[PDB]
Design a protein around this ligand. Structure first.
Ligand SMILES: *C[C@@](N)(CCC[C@H](N)C(=O)O)C(=O)O
Length: 274
């Protein structure tokens, strides 16, 4: 199996062409390969596949380091765009992809950054999925050490967004694991901790479902901004500072797609026998 290693803001990926290769594996193999000392080492593994809808360019699959398959990854989407361009699977400026859930559009900008149309944020609890009697802008999540308030939203994957006074001292280390597997999120959740600097600028840390705290989470950045906008605490264009760097998120509100812009970098190419 040939693969490439890439990263977006230090969130690192193995990306595999599954158009010209037949690519499949067990969760055990994914976990073996994710290991940084005995495997390849990665936060997520992505596959580029032929589309099921032939009007689209590609199908996009995402695997976590823990071996789980999920339906969204924002940093990965940017890497996916850079990969299919660099490797000559396409030369289109606007690339249309499907996922297990909705479609997305990946735009290769002239400054080489990628702007991703992530689709419209999903708010209805049952669709997130998230257990709640009614849609609310804030939900109460009880944990063993603290009850917190969060917004909840899906970008194709589930997010719970907690507002914090100071990003450096937020209890990500203890609260993150408690929220990530909270009983109200039947498919687990990415737990975001957001410090609002002003209406166009936040700092964010995300304890990811199936990966823990990493250097950056694009879909987490999307979710935090969507939640802040829904709550009336943020404007429609927001700079999000993550440990590994910054993303620009744009969202004009319900009925509209959310856009995420940022870097994507190819590192090396590899070959491995599974
Ligand atoms: C942080 C990010 N890589 C998301 C990866 C998927 C997440 N672990 C999940 O299980 O939903 C991203 O969006 O960049």
């Amino acid at each position: 199996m040939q693969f490439s290693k890439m990263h977006g803001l230090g969130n690192d990926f193995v990306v595999v062409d599954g158009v010209t290769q037949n690519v499949f594996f067990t969760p055990e193999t994914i976990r073996r390969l994710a290991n940084r000392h005995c495997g390849i080492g990665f936060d997520q593994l992505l596959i580029v596949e032929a589309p099921y809808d032939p009007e689209l360019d590609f199908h996009y699959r995402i695997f976590n380091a823990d071996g789980s398959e999920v339906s969204q990854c924002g940093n990965g989407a940017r890497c996916f765009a850079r990969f299919v361009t660099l490797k000559g699977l396409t030369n289109k400026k606007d690339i249309s992809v499907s996922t297990q859930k909705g479609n997305m559009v990946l735009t290769v900008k002239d400054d080489n950054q990628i702007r991703v149309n992530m689709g419209e944020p999903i708010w209805e609890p049952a669709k997130i999925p998230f257990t709640a009697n009614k849609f609310e802008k804030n939900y109460i999540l009880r944990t063993d050490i603290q009850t917190v308030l969060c917004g909840a939203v899906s970008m194709g994957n589930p997010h719970c967004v907690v507002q914090v006074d100071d990003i450096q001292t937020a209890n990500v280390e203890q609260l993150g694991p408690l929220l990530e597997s909270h009983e109200r999120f039947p498919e687990r959740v990415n737990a975001g901790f957001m410090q609002i600097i002003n209406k166009e600028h936040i700092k964010l840390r995300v304890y990811e479902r199936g990966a823990g705290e990493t250097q950056a989470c694009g879909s987490g950045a999307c979710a935090a901004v969507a939640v802040g906008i829904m709550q009336g605490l943020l404007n429609n264009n927001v700079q999000v500072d993550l440990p590994g760097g910054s993303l620009m998120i744009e969202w004009n509100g319900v009925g509209h797609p959310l856009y995420m812009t940022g870097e994507a970098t190819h590192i090396y190419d590899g070959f491995i026998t599974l």
